[PDB]
């Protein structure tokens, strides 16, 4: 059976022929209560002191108990299970080439990374999850050290010179759809370039970038509160209902598509692209539940360096490791160093027993490095040797969708609600933050009576 | 798209690695999530805390 | 009266997200009912449901 499956192509012998031969059987949960199962065909069925000699079924591989998102974790049995859960949650937010068809798809939100890489330390389940075809993340030289205190708590120190070379750069795509329609008998919406004297309501924004048909051409830089689609509805002389960009977008028009909807009316979709260079506050994560923002970025002359001139791309704090107990992170670093020096791809299937930390250390010691992965680093600012020896190695990190430019918000004065005449809600509506009941109670405990009065009466709506 | 090769999928501007299994309703991709429910036609026996029945069997 | 969230918009942020959304299960126990027994990881989920993949929060 193994040889026939080895020659799977040009023989049409497959899983159905394996099942029909009577060697593989499907067992559900109810029938599972009446069987005896083994991890391993020979390691649990040899001759030793007798535990059970009436086995009825055997596992194919024990690492098939994990799901799709948990099968990308290297050495998941060396981690804490809450950290495995957190990585299974954050693997869905990892940014990368989400599909090979992204240049046609006009999706509302899309993130694509410039240079995705397959992991140096991989699991055998990744081949069936197609992770090496559509990867989400870059292998990075990671040094675990306390350098300047900017990586404290969960923060990350990044290399600015690496970032300038394309490290974790990405494109953010947004699509705007607008549909002209004949809603009323005397109400018609048309795609046209608005003109100031013939349009009843014209905003302070400029309409010069539009064409005569009211649609902006691809390849034009656009910014905050600019006009991309010119739509006007007649007034029973015309009311302008043109759509604008989101605030602080600052993108470039990528593709403009015109078509007819189901009703037969003109339909337009415009895609706008924007590059996202990683910044202070952008969220980065490992494959082991170690998430955190970028604390600061240093150039290559300021980052610590080894004897060979290697500077880490990312410095993480050693305080994250001991409480969270993600030893799989360190084993992945050590295996990644061994794999990068050897020239192979490391294997991190969960229950192997053919890979040990001692074996990986013995493999690393042959290439001229310290067996536990430590190196002697030098101070970037002063050039002096660091007294401690820094654990450094390649580790697969991902970039998450949560960037600080999509979350920064401020409001002095602006729009108010129609009903209660209080400020609006949300970033997109230029809304205000909520001074809730707990904040009111905290100010009561403070005793700041006039501050509490200003927040609840003067900063919000006053009336007579 | 049933039974088509990778070249045919690329000629139709479809990703060969796309697994499918979803619906396109008004242009938006929609997926049906499986819902757990209690199995039918089988006898279960339970016991409630403050109910008047000491033992109850349901089917 | 109808159930909600049976059909959801397919998550297309990354390929792992798409696959995990296409292979997702749901329990119709309400999130407001606050009990540890339905949320616990049972012994019968060996090889049927991933023990690690679950949302954080009310679900």
């Amino acid at each position: 059976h193994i040889d026939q499956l080895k020659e799977r192509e040009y023989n049409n012998y497959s899983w159905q022929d394996l099942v029909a031969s009577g060697v593989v059987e499907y067992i559900d949960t109810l029938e599972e209560e009446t069987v005896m199962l083994a991890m391993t065909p020979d390691d649990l069925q040899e001759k030793e002191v007798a535990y059970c000699s009436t086995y009825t079924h055997c596992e194919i591989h024990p690492s098939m108990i994990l799901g799709v998102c948990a099968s990308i974790i290297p050495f998941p049995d060396h981690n804490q299970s809450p950290r495995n859960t957190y990585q299974s949650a954050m693997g869905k937010q990892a940014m990368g080439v989400y599909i090979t068809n992204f240049h046609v798809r006009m999706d509302t939100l899309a993130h694509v990374l410039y240079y995705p890489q397959k992991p140096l330390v991989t699991t055998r389940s990744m081949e069936y999850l197609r992770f090496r075809e559509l990867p989400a993340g870059i292998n990075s030289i990671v040094a675990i050290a306390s350098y300047t205190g900017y990586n404290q708590e969960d923060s990350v120190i990044m290399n600015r010179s690496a970032v300038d070379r394309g490290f974790f750069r990405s494109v953010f795509y947004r699509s705007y759809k607008e549909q002209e329609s004949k809603k009323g008998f005397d109400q018609e919406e048309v795609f046209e370039k608005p003109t100031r004297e013939t349009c009843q309501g014209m905003r302070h924004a400029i309409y010069d970038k539009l064409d005569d048909d009211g649609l902006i051409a691809p390849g034009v830089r656009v910014s905050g509160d600019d006009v991309i689609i010119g739509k006007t509805v007649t007034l029973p002389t015309k009311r302008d209902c043109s759509t604008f960009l989101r605030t602080s977008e600052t993108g470039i028009v990528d593709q403009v598509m015109v078509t007819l909807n189901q009703e037969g009316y003109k339909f337009c979709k415009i895609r706008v692209r924007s590059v996202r260079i990683p910044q202070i506050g952008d969220k980065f994560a490992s494959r082991h539940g170690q998430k955190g923002t970028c604390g600061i970025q240093y150039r290559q002359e300021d980052m610590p360096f080894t004897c060979e001139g290697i500077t880490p791309d990312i410095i993480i704090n050693p305080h994250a490791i001991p409480s969270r107990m993600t030893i799989g992170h360190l084993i992945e670093c050590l295996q990644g160093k061994v794999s990068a020096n050897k020239g192979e791809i490391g294997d991190a299937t969960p229950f192997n027993d053919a890979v040990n930390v001692q074996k990986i250390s013995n493999l690393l010691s042959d290439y001229g490095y310290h067996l536990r992965g430590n190196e002697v680093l030098y101070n970037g600012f002063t050039g002096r040797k660091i007294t401690s020896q820094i654990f450094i190695g390649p580790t697969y990190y991902q970039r998450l969708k949560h960037m600080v430019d999509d979350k920064i918000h401020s409001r002095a004065r602006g729009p108010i609600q129609i009903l209660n005449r209080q400020p609006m809600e949300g970033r997109s509506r230029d809304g205000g933050l909520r001074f809730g009941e707990m904040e009111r109670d905290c100010q009561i405990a403070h005793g700041a009576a006039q501050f509490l009065r200003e927040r609840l009466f003067e900063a919000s709506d006053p009336y007579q | 798209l049933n039974g088509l090769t990778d070249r045919d999928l690329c000629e139709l501007n479809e990703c060969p690695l796309d697994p499918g299994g979803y619906f396109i309703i008004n242009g938006s991709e929609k997926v049906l999530i499986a819902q757990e429910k209690m199995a039918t036609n089988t006898v279960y026996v339970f016991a409630k805390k403050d109910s008047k029945y000491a033992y109850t069997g349901e089917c | 009266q109808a159930r909600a969230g049976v059909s959801q918009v397919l998550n297309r942020l990354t390929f792992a997200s798409t696959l995990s959304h296409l292979r997702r299960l749901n329990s119709p126990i309400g999130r407001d009912g606050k009990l540890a027994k339905p949320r616990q990881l049972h012994n019968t989920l060996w090889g049927m449901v991933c023990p690690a993949e679950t949302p954080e929060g009310h679900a």
Binding site: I2, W15, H61 | - | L22
Partner: peptide
């Protein structure tokens, strides 16, 4: 006709055949 020493190759060949035939959205 038994595979005592090499089992990883056989196991992952079987798993590869399974995922080649069925897929990942086969239940849907």
């Amino acid at each position: 006709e038994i595979t005592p020493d090499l089992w990883q190759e056989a196991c992952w060949i079987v798993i590869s055949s399974y995922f080649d035939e069925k897929g990942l959205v086969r239940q849907q």
